[PDB]
Design an enzyme around this catalytic site. Structure first.
Site, PDB file in Angstrom:
ATOM      1  N   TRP A  79       0.810  -1.211   0.000  1.00 36.39           N
ATOM      2  CA  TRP A  79       0.000   0.000   0.000  1.00 36.39           C
ATOM      3  C   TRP A  79       0.844   1.263   0.000  1.00 36.39           C
ATOM      4  O   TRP A  79       0.313   2.350  -0.253  1.00 36.39           O
ATOM      5  CB  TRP A  79      -0.963   0.016   1.211  1.00 36.39           C
ATOM      6  CG  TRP A  79      -1.824  -1.197   1.257  1.00 36.39           C
ATOM      7  CD1 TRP A  79      -1.710  -2.251   2.121  1.00 36.39           C
ATOM      8  CD2 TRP A  79      -2.901  -1.524   0.363  1.00 36.39           C
ATOM      9  NE1 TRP A  79      -2.664  -3.203   1.835  1.00 36.39           N
ATOM     10  CE2 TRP A  79      -3.409  -2.780   0.763  1.00 36.39           C
ATOM     11  CE3 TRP A  79      -3.503  -0.864  -0.713  1.00 36.39           C
ATOM     12  CZ2 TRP A  79      -4.477  -3.397   0.115  1.00 36.39           C
ATOM     13  CZ3 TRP A  79      -4.585  -1.472  -1.352  1.00 36.39           C
ATOM     14  CH2 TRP A  79      -5.053  -2.730  -0.938  1.00 36.39           C
ATOM     15  N   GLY A 113      -6.906   5.566   1.426  1.00 32.94           N
ATOM     16  CA  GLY A 113      -5.714   5.759   2.229  1.00 32.94           C
ATOM     17  C   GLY A 113      -5.980   6.694   3.390  1.00 32.94           C
ATOM     18  O   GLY A 113      -5.086   7.420   3.839  1.00 32.94           O
ATOM     19  N   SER A 195     -12.548   2.686   0.280  1.00 36.50           N
ATOM     20  CA  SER A 195     -12.210   3.304   1.565  1.00 36.50           C
ATOM     21  C   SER A 195     -12.345   4.821   1.459  1.00 36.50           C
ATOM     22  O   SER A 195     -13.460   5.297   1.170  1.00 36.50           O
ATOM     23  CB  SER A 195     -10.833   2.782   1.984  1.00 36.50           C
ATOM     24  OG  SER A 195     -10.678   3.005   3.363  1.00 36.50           O
ATOM     25  N   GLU A 322     -13.820  -6.071   7.721  1.00 40.87           N
ATOM     26  CA  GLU A 322     -13.300  -4.708   7.572  1.00 40.87           C
ATOM     27  C   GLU A 322     -12.399  -4.286   8.730  1.00 40.87           C
ATOM     28  O   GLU A 322     -11.434  -3.538   8.532  1.00 40.87           O
ATOM     29  CB  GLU A 322     -14.468  -3.715   7.479  1.00 40.87           C
ATOM     30  CG  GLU A 322     -15.325  -3.859   6.246  1.00 40.87           C
ATOM     31  CD  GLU A 322     -14.617  -3.388   4.983  1.00 40.87           C
ATOM     32  OE1 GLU A 322     -13.446  -2.970   5.049  1.00 40.87           O
ATOM     33  OE2 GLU A 322     -15.246  -3.426   3.917  1.00 40.87           O
ATOM     34  N   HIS A 435     -10.079  -5.431   4.991  1.00 41.75           N
ATOM     35  CA  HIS A 435     -10.220  -4.140   4.325  1.00 41.75           C
ATOM     36  C   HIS A 435      -9.205  -3.991   3.203  1.00 41.75           C
ATOM     37  O   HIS A 435      -8.005  -4.175   3.417  1.00 41.75           O
ATOM     38  CB  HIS A 435     -10.029  -3.043   5.359  1.00 41.75           C
ATOM     39  CG  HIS A 435     -10.262  -1.664   4.833  1.00 41.75           C
ATOM     40  ND1 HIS A 435     -11.513  -1.200   4.491  1.00 41.75           N
ATOM     41  CD2 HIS A 435      -9.408  -0.635   4.626  1.00 41.75           C
ATOM     42  CE1 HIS A 435     -11.420   0.057   4.094  1.00 41.75           C
ATOM     43  NE2 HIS A 435     -10.154   0.425   4.175  1.00 41.75           N
TER      44      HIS A 435
HETATM   45  C1  LIG Z   1      -3.203   4.076  10.294  1.00 43.31           C
HETATM   46  C2  LIG Z   1      -3.196   2.948   9.929  1.00 43.31           C
HETATM   47  C3  LIG Z   1      -3.137   1.491   9.479  1.00 43.31           C
HETATM   48  N1  LIG Z   1      -4.053   1.212   8.767  1.00 43.31           N
HETATM   49  C4  LIG Z   1      -4.492   0.058   9.109  1.00 43.31           C
HETATM   50  C5  LIG Z   1      -4.793  -0.806   7.775  1.00 43.31           C
HETATM   51  C6  LIG Z   1      -4.398  -0.122   6.799  1.00 43.31           C
HETATM   52  C7  LIG Z   1      -5.574   0.453   6.010  1.00 43.31           C
HETATM   53  N2  LIG Z   1      -4.970   1.202   4.926  1.00 43.31           N
HETATM   54  C8  LIG Z   1      -4.183   0.513   3.902  1.00 43.31           C
HETATM   55  C9  LIG Z   1      -4.967   0.483   2.585  1.00 43.31           C
HETATM   56  O1  LIG Z   1      -5.985  -0.466   2.724  1.00 43.31           O
HETATM   57  C10 LIG Z   1      -7.067  -0.157   1.878  1.00 43.31           C
HETATM   58  C11 LIG Z   1      -5.087   2.642   4.854  1.00 43.31           C
HETATM   59  O2  LIG Z   1      -4.560   3.197   3.944  1.00 43.31           O
HETATM   60  C12 LIG Z   1      -5.901   3.474   5.868  1.00 43.31           C
HETATM   61  C13 LIG Z   1      -5.283   4.275   6.836  1.00 43.31           C
HETATM   62  C14 LIG Z   1      -6.068   5.025   7.705  1.00 43.31           C
HETATM   63  C15 LIG Z   1      -7.496   4.990   7.596  1.00 43.31           C
HETATM   64  C16 LIG Z   1      -8.290   5.762   8.482  1.00 43.31           C
HETATM   65  C17 LIG Z   1      -9.679   5.719   8.372  1.00 43.31           C
HETATM   66  C18 LIG Z   1     -10.279   4.924   7.398  1.00 43.31           C
HETATM   67  C19 LIG Z   1      -9.509   4.158   6.529  1.00 43.31           C
HETATM   68  C20 LIG Z   1      -8.092   4.207   6.650  1.00 43.31           C
HETATM   69  C21 LIG Z   1      -7.293   3.436   5.763  1.00 43.31           C
HETATM   70  C22 LIG Z   1      -3.553   1.047   7.355  1.00 43.31           C
END
Ligand SMILES: C#CCN1CC[C@@H](CN(CCOC)C(=O)c2ccc3ccccc3c2)C1
Ligand SMILES: *[C@@H]1O[C@H](CO[C@@H]2O[C@@H](C)[C@@H](O)[C@@H](O)[C@@H]2O)[C@@H](O[C@@H]2O[C@H](CO)[C@@H](O)[C@H](O)[C@H]2NC(C)=O)[C@H](O)[C@H]1NC(C)=O
Ligand SMILES: *[C@@H]1O[C@H](CO[C@@H]2O[C@@H](C)[C@@H](O)[C@@H](O)[C@@H]2O)[C@@H](O[C@@H]2O[C@H](CO)[C@@H](O)[C@H](O)[C@H]2NC(C)=O)[C@H](O)[C@H]1NC(C)=O
Ligand SMILES: *[C@@H]1O[C@H](CO[C@@H]2O[C@@H](C)[C@@H](O)[C@@H](O)[C@@H]2O)[C@@H](O[C@@H]2O[C@H](CO)[C@@H](O)[C@H](O)[C@H]2NC(C)=O)[C@H](O)[C@H]1NC(C)=O
Ligand SMILES: *[C@@H]1O[C@H](CO[C@@H]2O[C@@H](C)[C@@H](O)[C@@H](O)[C@@H]2O)[C@@H](O)[C@H](O)[C@H]1NC(C)=O
Ligand SMILES: *[C@@H]1O[C@H](CO)[C@@H](O)[C@H](O)[C@H]1NC(C)=O
Ligand SMILES: *[C@@H]1O[C@H](CO)[C@@H](O)[C@H](O)[C@H]1NC(C)=O
Ligand SMILES: [Cl-]
Length: 526
Positions: A79, A113, A195, A322, A435
């Site tokens: 990612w 993101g 997302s 999720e 997710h």
């Molecule tokens: C901080 C942190 C870690 N997270 C845990 C899992 C991972 C989720 N990913 C990666 C992309 O997977 C779609 C994100 O890019 C991301 C980061 C912050 C968010 C905040 C609210 C809603 C969605 C979000 C999505 C990253």
């Protein structure tokens, strides 16, 4: 292969895909680089060029902090951005079928993101398979994230908020003015995103400036009514001021604060972004969409409730697990390298991590509704409950509530529940259908036989790709030829949804009914 756009000629490149050809234009600029005095402003129009712009490689990704929580681990680093970070990042990508189509439906991807990270050049966003297999044109754009995209002083054009949403919008505008030169139909544009990208898609449904720039919408694991998706005026102010203080830019003239922040190197802004909130969580969105009075005229929950949005068809869905991805970014007892059996006390500790500003009573209410078990001796009871808490509250229940409220105004809506765990998922099995891990199926990566996907996964991706393209082209996500389960429209009464899995694709009703009544009717009061 050269195409004449409104601002000048661009050169693309031929790609070999499945015994066929796709033409890719990677890295077309669509806005003036938002540098110097343009930092924090809405994106400005692009001055024409006379050369042949070489669109033969992905451009810079926008400045952002990198996930460094698992260095070397493909599960997280897939990612992370895969091109140079730069403020000079307002570029888009175009995949067109070969031979050049005559009036192809256009699919425009908006990455997620958390509005802090992301880039259109990720491997799982590669649009060449959709162009090859379905003869649609795929477009994706980079848009500004973090404070550089969403710093807000409402009403002040030096930093008005929602700049990254205006980047997306100027990109949709580019497709309207230019995609016919590529064989695309500007009257058949479907936005899709996952997302924060899905929350962005849903905000384009609300924004009057976007109404005429697309036809339909697909929302994967996200919507603006998710609790992380929209920053209120109070927080956005406190966070702008805290960034000013952390960087030494505190002034009384707010326009002078922005001038001061404009002299800061992008790195200095990025390192202080994390601390503008006193209590962060893995789901924190420090700088995200705000009610700016331009892109977004009112609090979007009011707009949704009162039917003030673009009337069109939507495809919405969520993944079965999720929540789990966020647990290993801070919840005690959790680890991607063991099975994360946690205790009652660890569960309670996890709620403090995920609901830091919530009262004792509010955290007790979560525990009460999620820890009434059938067999209270199942050792993973609390591990699974915490994943469901995070996923239901942050993604599933907001997506269902968005879909119910949207469909009440007459439009066909289709809801899916994605429950296949990728055979190549690098995260452990207890995290389930995580997710973000439907995206590779939507983009058709398992159609590549040279990859390590099973045959069941090729077939599942093939059907999903056909359903998404049929939705984009015709507003109806059916697979009409291979005796597939018909996908019924989601109505606020019966609430039918389709499950997506390799085994049996089923019609179900009222997903997470008991859980969403808690989050959607009760929890907002506390
Ligand atoms: C901080 C942190 C870690 N997270 C845990 C899992 C991972 C989720 N990913 C990666 C992309 O997977 C779609 C994100 O890019 C991301 C980061 C912050 C968010 C905040 C609210 C809603 C969605 C979000 C999505 C990253
Ligand atoms: C490309 O096709 C369009 C029609 O697209 C369809 O109709 C849209 C409203 C939407 O439902 C899409 O998903 C459909 O695929 C043609 O549009 C016509 O254009 C002419 C000239 O501009 C106009 O007079 C007609 O009213 C349009 N018809 C509509 C709006 O229904 C368009 O001509 C096609 N272009 C090419 C180059 O093939
Ligand atoms: C609004 O912001 C203030 C100030 O935030 C502090 O300064 C920033 C530059 C940054 O470093 C933050 O982490 C700081 O907390 C917040 O007030 C602070 O709140 C915490 C915990 O509530 C407390 O321990 C600090 O002493 C407070 N500092 C001051 C000067 O009051 C305040 O909480 C923010 N409001 C909201 C709703 O989050
Ligand atoms: C699962 O692991 C967590 C995290 O521990 C880390 O990662 C492990 C895979 C291993 O390499 C450990 O050395 C690492 O510390 C465990 O939680 C920790 O448990 C210890 C017990 O001594 C405790 O002191 C720490 O605070 C915990 N770390 C936290 C809360 O972040 C957990 O116990 C493991 N669970 C199982 C079932 O194996
Ligand atoms: C833009 O690209 C032009 C053509 O690229 C070259 O020629 C084609 C036929 C392919 O073989 C391609 O891989 C080659 O790189 C260059 O002539 C021109 O200099 C480029 N402009 C730049 C780099 O600013
Ligand atoms: C703040 O500075 C700007 C730009 O120099 C100026 O136009 C504006 O009037 C100033 N406002 C105040 C209240 O001094
Ligand atoms: C339908 O099934 C055939 C095999 O009988 C396969 O080749 C074809 O691609 C399938 N189509 C879709 C859209 O799943
Ligand atoms: Cl209840």
């Amino acid at each position: 292969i050269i195409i004449a756009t409104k601002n000048g000629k661009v050169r693309g490149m031929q790609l070999t895909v499945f015994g066929g050809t796709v033409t890719a234009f990677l890295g077309i600029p669509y806005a003036q680089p938002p540098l110097g005095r343009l930092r924090f402003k809405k994106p400005q129009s692009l001055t024409k060029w006379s050369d042949i712009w070489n669109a033969t490689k992905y451009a810079n990704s926008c400045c952002q902090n990198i996930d460094q929580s698992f260095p070397g681990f493909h599960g997280s680093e897939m990612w992370n951005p895969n091109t140079d970070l730069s403020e000079d990042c307002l570029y888009l990508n175009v995949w067109i079928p070969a031979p050049k189509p005559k009036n192809a439906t256009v699919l425009i991807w908006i990455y997620g993101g958390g509005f802090q990270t992301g880039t259109s050049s990720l491997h799982v966003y590669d649009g060449k398979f959709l162009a090859r297999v379905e003869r649609v044109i795929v477009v994706s754009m980079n848009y500004r994230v973090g404070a550089l995209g969403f710093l807000a002083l409402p009403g002040n054009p030096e930093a008005p908020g929602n700049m990254g949403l205006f980047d997306q919008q100027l990109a949709l505008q580019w497709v309207q003015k230019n995609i016919a030169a590529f064989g695309g139909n500007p009257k058949s544009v479907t936005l899709f995103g996952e997302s924060a990208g899905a929350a962005s898609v849903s905000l384009h449904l609300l924004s009057p400036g976007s109404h005429s720039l697309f036809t339909r919408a697909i929302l994967q694991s996200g919507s603006f009514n998710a609790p992380w998706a929209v920053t209120s005026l109070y927080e956005a102010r406190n966070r702008t001021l805290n960034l000013a203080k952390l960087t030494g830019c505190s002034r009384e003239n707010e326009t002078e604060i922005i001038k001061c922040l404009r002299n800061k190197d992008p790195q200095e802004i990025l390192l202080n972004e994390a601390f503008v909130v006193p209590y962060g969580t893995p789901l924190s969105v420090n700088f995200g969409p705000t009610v700016d009075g331009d892109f977004l005229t009112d609090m979007p929950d009011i707009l949704l409730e009162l039917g003030q949005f673009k009337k069109t068809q939507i495809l919405v869905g969520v993944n079965k697990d999720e929540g789990t991805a966020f647990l290993v970014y801070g919840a005690p007892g959790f680890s991607k390298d063991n099975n994360s059996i946690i205790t009652r006390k660890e569960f309670q500790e996890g709620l403090k991590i995920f609901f830091p500003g919530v009262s004792e009573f509010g955290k007790e209410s979560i525990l009460f509704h999620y820890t009434d078990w059938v067999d209270d001796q199942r050792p993973e009871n609390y591990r699974e409950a915490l994943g469901d808490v995070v996923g239901d509250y942050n993604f599933i229940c907001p997506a269902l509530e968005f879909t119910k409220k949207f469909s009440e105004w007459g439009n066909n809506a289709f809801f899916y529940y994605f429950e296949h765990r990728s055979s190549k998922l690098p995260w452990p099995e207890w995290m389930g259908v995580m997710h973000g891990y439907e995206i590779e199926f939507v983009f058709g990566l398992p159609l590549e036989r040279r990859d390590q996907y099973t045959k069941a996964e090729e077939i599942l991706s093939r059907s999903i790709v056909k359903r998404w393209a049929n939705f984009a082209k015709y507003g109806n996500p059916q697979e009409t030829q291979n005796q597939s389960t018909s996908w019924p429209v989601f109505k606020s009464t019966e609430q039918k949804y389709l499950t997506l899995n390799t085994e049996s694709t089923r019609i179900m009703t009222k997903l997470r009914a008991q859980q969403c009544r808690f989050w959607t009717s009760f929890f907002p009061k506390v």
